[PDB]
CSV table of C-alpha atoms and ligand atoms in Angstrom, one decimal:
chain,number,residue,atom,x,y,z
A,1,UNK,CA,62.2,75.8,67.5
A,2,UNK,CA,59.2,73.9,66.2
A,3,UNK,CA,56.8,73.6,68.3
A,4,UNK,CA,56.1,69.9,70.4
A,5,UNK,CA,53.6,67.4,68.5
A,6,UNK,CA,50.3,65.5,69.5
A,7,UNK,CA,52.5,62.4,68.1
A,8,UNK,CA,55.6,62.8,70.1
A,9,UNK,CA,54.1,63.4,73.3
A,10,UNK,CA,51.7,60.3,72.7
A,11,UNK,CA,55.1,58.0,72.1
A,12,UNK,CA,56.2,59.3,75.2
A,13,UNK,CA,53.3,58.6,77.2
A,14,UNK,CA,52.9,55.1,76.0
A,15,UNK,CA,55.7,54.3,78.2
A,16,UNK,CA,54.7,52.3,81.4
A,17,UNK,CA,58.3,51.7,82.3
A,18,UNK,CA,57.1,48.1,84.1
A,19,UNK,CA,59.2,46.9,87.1
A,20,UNK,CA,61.5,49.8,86.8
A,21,UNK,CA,61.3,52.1,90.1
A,22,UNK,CA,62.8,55.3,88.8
A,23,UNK,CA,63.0,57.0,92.3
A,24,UNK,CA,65.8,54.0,93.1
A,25,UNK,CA,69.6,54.7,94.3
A,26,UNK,CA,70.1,51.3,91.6
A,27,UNK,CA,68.0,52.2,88.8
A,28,UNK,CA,69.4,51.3,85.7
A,29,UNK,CA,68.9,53.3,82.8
A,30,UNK,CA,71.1,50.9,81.0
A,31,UNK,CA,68.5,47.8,81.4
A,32,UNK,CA,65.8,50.5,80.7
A,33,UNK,CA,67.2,51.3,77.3
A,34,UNK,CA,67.4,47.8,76.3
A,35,UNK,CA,63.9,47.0,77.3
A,36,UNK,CA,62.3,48.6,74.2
A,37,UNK,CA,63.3,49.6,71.1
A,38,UNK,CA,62.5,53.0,72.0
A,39,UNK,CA,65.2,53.6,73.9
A,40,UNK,CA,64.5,57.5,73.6
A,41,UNK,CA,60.9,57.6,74.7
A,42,UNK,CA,61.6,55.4,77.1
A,43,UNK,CA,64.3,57.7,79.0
A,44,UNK,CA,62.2,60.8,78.0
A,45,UNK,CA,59.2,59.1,80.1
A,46,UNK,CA,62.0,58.6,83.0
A,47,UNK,CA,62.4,62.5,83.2
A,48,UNK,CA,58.4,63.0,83.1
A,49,UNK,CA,57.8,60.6,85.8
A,50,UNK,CA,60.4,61.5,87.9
A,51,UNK,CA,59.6,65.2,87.4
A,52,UNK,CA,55.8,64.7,88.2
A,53,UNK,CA,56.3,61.9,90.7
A,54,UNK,CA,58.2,65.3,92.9
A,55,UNK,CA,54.7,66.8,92.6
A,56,UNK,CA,57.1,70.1,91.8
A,57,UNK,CA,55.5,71.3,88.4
A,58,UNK,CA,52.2,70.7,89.6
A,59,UNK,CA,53.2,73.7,92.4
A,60,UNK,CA,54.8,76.1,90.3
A,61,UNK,CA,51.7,75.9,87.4
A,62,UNK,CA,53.5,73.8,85.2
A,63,UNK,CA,51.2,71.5,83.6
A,64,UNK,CA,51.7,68.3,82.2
A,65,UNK,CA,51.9,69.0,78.6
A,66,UNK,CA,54.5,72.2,79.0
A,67,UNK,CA,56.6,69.4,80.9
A,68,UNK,CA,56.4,67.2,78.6
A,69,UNK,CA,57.0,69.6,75.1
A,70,UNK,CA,60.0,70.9,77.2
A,71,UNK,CA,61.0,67.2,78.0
A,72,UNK,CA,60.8,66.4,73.7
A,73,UNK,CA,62.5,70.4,73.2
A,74,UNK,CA,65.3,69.4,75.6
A,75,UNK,CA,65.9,65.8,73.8
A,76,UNK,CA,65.5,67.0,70.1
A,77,UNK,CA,68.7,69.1,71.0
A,78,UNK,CA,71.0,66.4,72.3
A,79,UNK,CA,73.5,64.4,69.5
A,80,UNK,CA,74.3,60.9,68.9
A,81,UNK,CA,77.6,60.8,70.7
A,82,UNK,CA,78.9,57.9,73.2
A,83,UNK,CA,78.9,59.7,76.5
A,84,UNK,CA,77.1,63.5,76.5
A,85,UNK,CA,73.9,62.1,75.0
A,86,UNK,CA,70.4,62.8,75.9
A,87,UNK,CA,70.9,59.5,77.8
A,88,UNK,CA,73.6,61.1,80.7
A,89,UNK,CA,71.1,64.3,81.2
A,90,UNK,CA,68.1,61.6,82.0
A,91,UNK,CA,70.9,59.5,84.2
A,92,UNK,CA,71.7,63.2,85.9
A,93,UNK,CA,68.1,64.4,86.4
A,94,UNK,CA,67.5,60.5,88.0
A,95,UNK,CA,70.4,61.0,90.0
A,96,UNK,CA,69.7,64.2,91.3
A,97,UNK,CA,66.0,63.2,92.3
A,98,UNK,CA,67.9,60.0,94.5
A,99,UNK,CA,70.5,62.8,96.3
A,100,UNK,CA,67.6,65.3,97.2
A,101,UNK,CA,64.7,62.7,98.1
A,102,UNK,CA,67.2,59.5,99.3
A,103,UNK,CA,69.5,61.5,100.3
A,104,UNK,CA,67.2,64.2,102.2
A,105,UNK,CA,69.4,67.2,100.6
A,106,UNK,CA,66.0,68.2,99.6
A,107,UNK,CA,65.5,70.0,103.3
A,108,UNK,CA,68.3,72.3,102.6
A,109,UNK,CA,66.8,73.6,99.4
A,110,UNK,CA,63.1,75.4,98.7
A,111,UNK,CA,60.9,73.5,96.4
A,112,UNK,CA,61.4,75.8,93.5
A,113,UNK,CA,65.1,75.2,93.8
A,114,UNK,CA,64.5,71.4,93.7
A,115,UNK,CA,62.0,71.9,90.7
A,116,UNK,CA,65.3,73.8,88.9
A,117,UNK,CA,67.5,71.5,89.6
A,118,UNK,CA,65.7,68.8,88.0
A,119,UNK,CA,65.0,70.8,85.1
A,120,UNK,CA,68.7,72.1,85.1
A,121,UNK,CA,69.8,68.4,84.9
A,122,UNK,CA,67.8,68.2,81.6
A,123,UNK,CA,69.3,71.3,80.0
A,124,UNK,CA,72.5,71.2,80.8
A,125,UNK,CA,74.8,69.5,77.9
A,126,UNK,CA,72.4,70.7,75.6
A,127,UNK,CA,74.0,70.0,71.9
A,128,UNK,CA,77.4,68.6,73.4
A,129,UNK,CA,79.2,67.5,70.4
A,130,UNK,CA,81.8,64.9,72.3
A,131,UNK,CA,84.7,67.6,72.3
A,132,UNK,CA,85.0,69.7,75.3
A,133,UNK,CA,86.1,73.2,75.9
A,134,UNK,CA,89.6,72.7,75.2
A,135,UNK,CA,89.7,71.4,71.4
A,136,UNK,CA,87.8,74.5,70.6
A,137,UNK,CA,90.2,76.7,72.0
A,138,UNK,CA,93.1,74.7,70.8
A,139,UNK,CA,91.9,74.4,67.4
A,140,UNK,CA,90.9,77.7,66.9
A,141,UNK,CA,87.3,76.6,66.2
A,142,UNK,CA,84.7,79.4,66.1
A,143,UNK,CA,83.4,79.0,68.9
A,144,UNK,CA,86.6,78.6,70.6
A,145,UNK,CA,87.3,82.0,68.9
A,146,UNK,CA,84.1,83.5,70.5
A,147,UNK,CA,84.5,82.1,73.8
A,148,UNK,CA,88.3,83.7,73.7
A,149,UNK,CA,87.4,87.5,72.2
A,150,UNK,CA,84.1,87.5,74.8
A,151,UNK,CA,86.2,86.8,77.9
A,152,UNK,CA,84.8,83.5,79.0
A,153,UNK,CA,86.6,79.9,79.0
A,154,UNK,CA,83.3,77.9,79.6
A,155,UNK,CA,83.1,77.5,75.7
A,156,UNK,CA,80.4,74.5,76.3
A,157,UNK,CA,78.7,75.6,79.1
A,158,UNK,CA,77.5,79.1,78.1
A,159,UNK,CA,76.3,77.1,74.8
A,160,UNK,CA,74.0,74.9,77.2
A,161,UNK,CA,72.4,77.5,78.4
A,162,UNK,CA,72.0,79.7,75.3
A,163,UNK,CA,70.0,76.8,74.1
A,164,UNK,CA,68.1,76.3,77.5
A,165,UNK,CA,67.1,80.0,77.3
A,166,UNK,CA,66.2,79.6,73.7
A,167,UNK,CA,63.6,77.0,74.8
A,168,UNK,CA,62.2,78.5,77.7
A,169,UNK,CA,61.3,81.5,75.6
A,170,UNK,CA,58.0,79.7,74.0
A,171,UNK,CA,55.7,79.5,76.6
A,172,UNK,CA,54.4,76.3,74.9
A,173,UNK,CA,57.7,74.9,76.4
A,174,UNK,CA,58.9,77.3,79.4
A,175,UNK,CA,58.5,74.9,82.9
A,176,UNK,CA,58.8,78.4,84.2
A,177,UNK,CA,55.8,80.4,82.7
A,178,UNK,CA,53.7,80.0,86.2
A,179,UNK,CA,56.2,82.1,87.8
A,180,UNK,CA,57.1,86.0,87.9
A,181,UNK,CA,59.3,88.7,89.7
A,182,UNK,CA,61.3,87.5,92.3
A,183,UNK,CA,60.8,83.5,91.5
A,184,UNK,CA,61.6,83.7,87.7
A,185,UNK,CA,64.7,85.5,88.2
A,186,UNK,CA,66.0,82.9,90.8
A,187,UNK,CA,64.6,80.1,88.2
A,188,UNK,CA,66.8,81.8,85.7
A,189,UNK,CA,69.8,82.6,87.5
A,190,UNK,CA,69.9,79.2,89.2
A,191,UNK,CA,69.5,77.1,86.3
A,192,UNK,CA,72.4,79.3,85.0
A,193,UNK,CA,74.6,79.6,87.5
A,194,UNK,CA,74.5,75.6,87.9
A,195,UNK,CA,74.9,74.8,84.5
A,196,UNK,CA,77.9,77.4,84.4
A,197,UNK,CA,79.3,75.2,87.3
A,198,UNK,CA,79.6,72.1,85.8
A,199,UNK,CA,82.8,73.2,83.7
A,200,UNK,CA,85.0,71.2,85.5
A,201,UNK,CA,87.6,73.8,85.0
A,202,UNK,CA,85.9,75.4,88.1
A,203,UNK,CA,85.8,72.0,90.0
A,204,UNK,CA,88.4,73.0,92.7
A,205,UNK,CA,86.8,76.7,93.9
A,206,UNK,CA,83.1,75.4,93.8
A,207,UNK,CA,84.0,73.0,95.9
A,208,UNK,CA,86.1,74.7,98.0
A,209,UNK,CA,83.6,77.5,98.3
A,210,UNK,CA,80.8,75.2,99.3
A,211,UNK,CA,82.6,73.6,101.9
A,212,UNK,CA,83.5,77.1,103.2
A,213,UNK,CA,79.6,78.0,103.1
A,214,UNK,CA,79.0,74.9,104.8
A,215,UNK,CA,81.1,75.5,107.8
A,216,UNK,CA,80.3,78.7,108.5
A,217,UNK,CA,76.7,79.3,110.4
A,218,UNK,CA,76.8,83.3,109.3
A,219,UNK,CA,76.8,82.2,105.6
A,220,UNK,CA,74.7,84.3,103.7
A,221,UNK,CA,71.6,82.0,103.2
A,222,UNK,CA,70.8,82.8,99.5
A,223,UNK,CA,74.3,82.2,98.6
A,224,UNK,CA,74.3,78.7,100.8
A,225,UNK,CA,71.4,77.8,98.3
A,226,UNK,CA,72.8,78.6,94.8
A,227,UNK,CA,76.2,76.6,96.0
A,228,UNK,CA,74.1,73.8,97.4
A,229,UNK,CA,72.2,73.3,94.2
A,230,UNK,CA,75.5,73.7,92.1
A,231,UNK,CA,77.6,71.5,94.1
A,232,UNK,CA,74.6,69.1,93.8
A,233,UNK,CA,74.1,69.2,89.6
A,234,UNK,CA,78.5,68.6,90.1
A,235,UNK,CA,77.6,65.6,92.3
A,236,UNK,CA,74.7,64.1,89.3
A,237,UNK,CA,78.0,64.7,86.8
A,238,UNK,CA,80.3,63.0,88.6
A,239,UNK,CA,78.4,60.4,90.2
A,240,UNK,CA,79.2,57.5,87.8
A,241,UNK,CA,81.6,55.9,90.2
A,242,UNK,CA,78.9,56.0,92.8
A,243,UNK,CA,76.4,53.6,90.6
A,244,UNK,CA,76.4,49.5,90.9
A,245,UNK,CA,79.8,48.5,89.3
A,246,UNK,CA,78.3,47.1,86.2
A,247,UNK,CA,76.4,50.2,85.9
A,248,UNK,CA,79.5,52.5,86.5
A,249,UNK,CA,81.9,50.3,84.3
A,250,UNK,CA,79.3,51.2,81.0
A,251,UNK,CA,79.2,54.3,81.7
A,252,UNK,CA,83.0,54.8,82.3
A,253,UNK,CA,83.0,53.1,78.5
A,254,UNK,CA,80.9,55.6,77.0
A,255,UNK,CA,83.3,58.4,78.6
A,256,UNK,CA,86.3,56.6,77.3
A,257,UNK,CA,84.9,56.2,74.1
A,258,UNK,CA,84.3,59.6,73.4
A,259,UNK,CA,87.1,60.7,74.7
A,260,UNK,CA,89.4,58.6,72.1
A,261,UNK,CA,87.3,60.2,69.6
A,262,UNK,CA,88.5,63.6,70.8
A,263,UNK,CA,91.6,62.1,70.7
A,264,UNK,CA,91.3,60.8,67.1
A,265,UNK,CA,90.5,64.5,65.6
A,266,UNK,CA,93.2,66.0,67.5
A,267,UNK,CA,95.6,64.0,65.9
A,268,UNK,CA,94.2,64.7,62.4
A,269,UNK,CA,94.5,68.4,63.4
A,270,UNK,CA,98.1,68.0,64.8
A,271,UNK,CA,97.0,69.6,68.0
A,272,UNK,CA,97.9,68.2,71.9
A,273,UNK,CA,96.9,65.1,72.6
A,274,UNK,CA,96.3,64.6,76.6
A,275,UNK,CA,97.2,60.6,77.5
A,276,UNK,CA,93.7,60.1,78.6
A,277,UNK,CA,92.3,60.8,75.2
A,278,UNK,CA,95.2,58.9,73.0
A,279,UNK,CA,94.0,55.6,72.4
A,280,UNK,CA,97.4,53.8,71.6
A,281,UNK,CA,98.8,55.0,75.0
A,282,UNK,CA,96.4,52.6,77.3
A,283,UNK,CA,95.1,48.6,78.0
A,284,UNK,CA,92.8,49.5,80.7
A,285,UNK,CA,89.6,51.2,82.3
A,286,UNK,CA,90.6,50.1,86.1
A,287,UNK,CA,93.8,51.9,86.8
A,288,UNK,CA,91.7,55.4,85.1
A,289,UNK,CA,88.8,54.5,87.2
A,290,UNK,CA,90.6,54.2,90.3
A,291,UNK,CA,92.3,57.2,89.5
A,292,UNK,CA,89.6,59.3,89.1
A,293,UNK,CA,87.8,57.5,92.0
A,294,UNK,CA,91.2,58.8,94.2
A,295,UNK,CA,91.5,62.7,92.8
A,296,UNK,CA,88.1,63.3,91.9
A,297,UNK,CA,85.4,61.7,93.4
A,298,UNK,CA,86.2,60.2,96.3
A,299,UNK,CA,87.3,63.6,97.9
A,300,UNK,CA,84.5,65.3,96.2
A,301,UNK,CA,81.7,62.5,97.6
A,302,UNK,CA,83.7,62.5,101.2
A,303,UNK,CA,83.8,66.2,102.1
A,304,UNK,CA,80.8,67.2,101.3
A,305,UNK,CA,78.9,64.5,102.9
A,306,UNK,CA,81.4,65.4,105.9
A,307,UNK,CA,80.3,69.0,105.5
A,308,UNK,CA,76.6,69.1,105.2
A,309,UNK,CA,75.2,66.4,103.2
A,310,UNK,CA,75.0,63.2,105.6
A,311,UNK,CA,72.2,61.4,103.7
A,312,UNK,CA,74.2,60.9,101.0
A,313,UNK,CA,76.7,58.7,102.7
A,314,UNK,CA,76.0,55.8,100.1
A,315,UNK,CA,77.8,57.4,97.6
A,316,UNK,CA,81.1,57.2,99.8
A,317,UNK,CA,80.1,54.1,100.4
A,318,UNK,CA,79.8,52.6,97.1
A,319,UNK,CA,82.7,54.7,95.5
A,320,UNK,CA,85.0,52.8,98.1
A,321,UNK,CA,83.1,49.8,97.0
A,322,UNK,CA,83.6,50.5,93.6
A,323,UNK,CA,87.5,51.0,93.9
A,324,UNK,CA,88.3,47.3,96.0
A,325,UNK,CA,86.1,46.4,92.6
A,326,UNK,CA,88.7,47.5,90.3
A,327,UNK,CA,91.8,46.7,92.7
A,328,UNK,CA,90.3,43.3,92.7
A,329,UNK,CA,90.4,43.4,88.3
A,330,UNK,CA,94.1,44.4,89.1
A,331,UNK,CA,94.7,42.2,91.6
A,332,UNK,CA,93.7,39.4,89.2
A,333,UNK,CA,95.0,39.9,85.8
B,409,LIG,C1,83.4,57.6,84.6
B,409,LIG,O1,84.6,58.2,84.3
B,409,LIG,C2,84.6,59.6,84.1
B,409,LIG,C3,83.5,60.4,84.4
B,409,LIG,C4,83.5,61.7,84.0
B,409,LIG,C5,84.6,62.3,83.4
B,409,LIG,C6,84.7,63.8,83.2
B,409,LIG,N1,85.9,64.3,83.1
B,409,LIG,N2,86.0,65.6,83.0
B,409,LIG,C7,87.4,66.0,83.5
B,409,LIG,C8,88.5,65.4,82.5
B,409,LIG,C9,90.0,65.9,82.6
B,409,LIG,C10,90.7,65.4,83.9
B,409,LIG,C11,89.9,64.8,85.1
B,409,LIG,C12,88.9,65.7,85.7
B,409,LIG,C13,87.5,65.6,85.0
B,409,LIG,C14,85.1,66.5,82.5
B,409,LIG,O2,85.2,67.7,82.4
B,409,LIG,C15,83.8,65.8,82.1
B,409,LIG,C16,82.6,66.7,81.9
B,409,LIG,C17,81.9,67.1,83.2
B,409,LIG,C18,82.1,66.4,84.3
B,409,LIG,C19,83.1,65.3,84.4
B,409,LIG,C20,83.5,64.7,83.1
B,409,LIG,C21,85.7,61.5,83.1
B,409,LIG,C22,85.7,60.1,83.5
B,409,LIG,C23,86.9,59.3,83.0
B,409,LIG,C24,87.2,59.2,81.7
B,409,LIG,C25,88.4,58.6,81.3
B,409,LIG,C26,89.2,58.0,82.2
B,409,LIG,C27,90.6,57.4,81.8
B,409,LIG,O3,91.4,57.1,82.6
B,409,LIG,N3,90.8,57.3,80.5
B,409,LIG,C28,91.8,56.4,80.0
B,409,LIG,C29,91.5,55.0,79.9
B,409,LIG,N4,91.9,54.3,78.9
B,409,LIG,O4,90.8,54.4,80.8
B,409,LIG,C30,88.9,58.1,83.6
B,409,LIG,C31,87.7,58.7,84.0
B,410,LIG,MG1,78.8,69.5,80.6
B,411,LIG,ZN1,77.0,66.5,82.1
């Protein structure tokens, strides 16, 4: 990796962001792209000011330029796709700073796992490509090969954070380099262990181990912590449906997008094609949106707000807000 620029950060810090309030629950990274034709510094200077504006780096001896050079390394490593661009890991990292500081989840967690999990956010599509896990082992890809002969199914996610660990290993960019012992190793391992969550392969026992955790007063306390700070990195994935509809409905474009284009190279491989990524089998985002509103996030959103995580009862809210939305598109066409 080449090392950060005066130049780069400069473009970065020129940013002011004005009348954007990045700490929002209806921030919208959307308008903030738009307002300059910058888009990319602009959502770079997002992640810096939300990452100082916790005061976390500060604590942990991370000063402002390592932030900031890790902030460009991270970026310079994301692809121009529709969805899993540099863009969704900003919209995550935002996200994530709403569900521990609005949402309070930050009292379950220490401050260096709050500092990793907005860091985490940052690193963890790193050089997503718009295909996930299986088209490469369906295709027989290389990687799909690898993943396959080494044992582990999370083709994508063990990429992530190859790259993540690639970047933290010049101290010129490691957000990590004021720690040592006991605190690097957790900085390490959580940043890992969350990233290696997000395959949503896994969606079904995370939860359900959380929720477990949750319920249970003997839970051991470490463990209660790494699934907390995974199940909250799944919730910053997920939480499209929990954004202002207009908001929601761009992003659920961007997904669908991407996944046509998945779609597209499957059938020029003559591989499976799954309905949701076929784009002559469908007319319309509402009925997906409502259907991943009513097996994925709405139970996701609901149990563990039910479970532990009370402060974030707006994302309920606006998920069941979001869904008389779309019945309402439905109900009107
Ligand atoms: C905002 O919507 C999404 C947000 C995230 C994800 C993600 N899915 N998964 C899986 C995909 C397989 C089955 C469902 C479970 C989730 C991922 O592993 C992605 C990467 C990580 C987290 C969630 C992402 C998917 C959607 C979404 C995309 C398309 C439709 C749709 O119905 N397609 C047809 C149309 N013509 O409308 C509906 C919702
Ligand atoms: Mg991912
Ligand atoms: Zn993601």
């Amino acid at each position: 990796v080449t090392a950060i620029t005066k130049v780069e950060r400069e473009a970065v810090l020129v940013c002011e962001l004005p009348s954007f309030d990045v700490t929002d629950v209806e921030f919208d990274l959307f308008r903030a792209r738009e307002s300059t034709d910058k888009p990319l510094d602009v959502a770079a200077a997002i992640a810096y000011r939300l990452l100082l504006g916790s005061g976390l780096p500060q604590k942990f001896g991370c000063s402002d330029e390592v932030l900031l050079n890790f902030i460009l390394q991270c970026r310079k490593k994301y692809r121009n796709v529709p969805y899993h661009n540099f863009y969704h890991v900003v919209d995550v990292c935002q996200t994530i700073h709403t569900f521990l500081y609005r949402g309070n989840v930050y009292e379950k967690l220490t401050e260096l796992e709050c500092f990793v999990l907005l860091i985490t956010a940052l690193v963890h599509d790193l050089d997503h490509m718009g295909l996930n896990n299986s088209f490469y082992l369906k295709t027989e890809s290389p990687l799909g090969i690898l993943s396959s002969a080494s044992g582990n199914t999370s083709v994508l996610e063990v990429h992530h954070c190859n790259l993540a660990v690639e970047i933290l290993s010049d101290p010129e960019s490691d957000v990590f380099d004021g720690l040592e012992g006991a605190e690097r190793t957790l900085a390490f391992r959580s940043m890992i262990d969350c990233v290696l969550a997000t395959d949503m392969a896994k969606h079904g026992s995370a939860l359900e181990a959380f929720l477990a955790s949750a319920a249970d007063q003997s839970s051991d306390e470490a463990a209660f912590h790494r699934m907390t700070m995974e199940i909250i990195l799944k919730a910053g994935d997920i939480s499209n449906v929990t954004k202002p509809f207009d908001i929601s409905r761009q992003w659920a474009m961007a997904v669908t997008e991407e996944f046509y284009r998945q779609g597209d190279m499957e059938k020029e491989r003559g591989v499976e094609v799954l309905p949701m990524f076929d784009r002559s089998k469908n007319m319309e985002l509402a009925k997906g949106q409502i259907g991943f509103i009513d097996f994925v996030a709405a139970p996701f959103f609901q149990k563990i707000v039910d479970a532990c995580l009370q402060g974030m009862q707006w994302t309920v809210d606006r998920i069941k807000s979001n869904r008389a939305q779309w019945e309402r598109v439905l109900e009107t066409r």
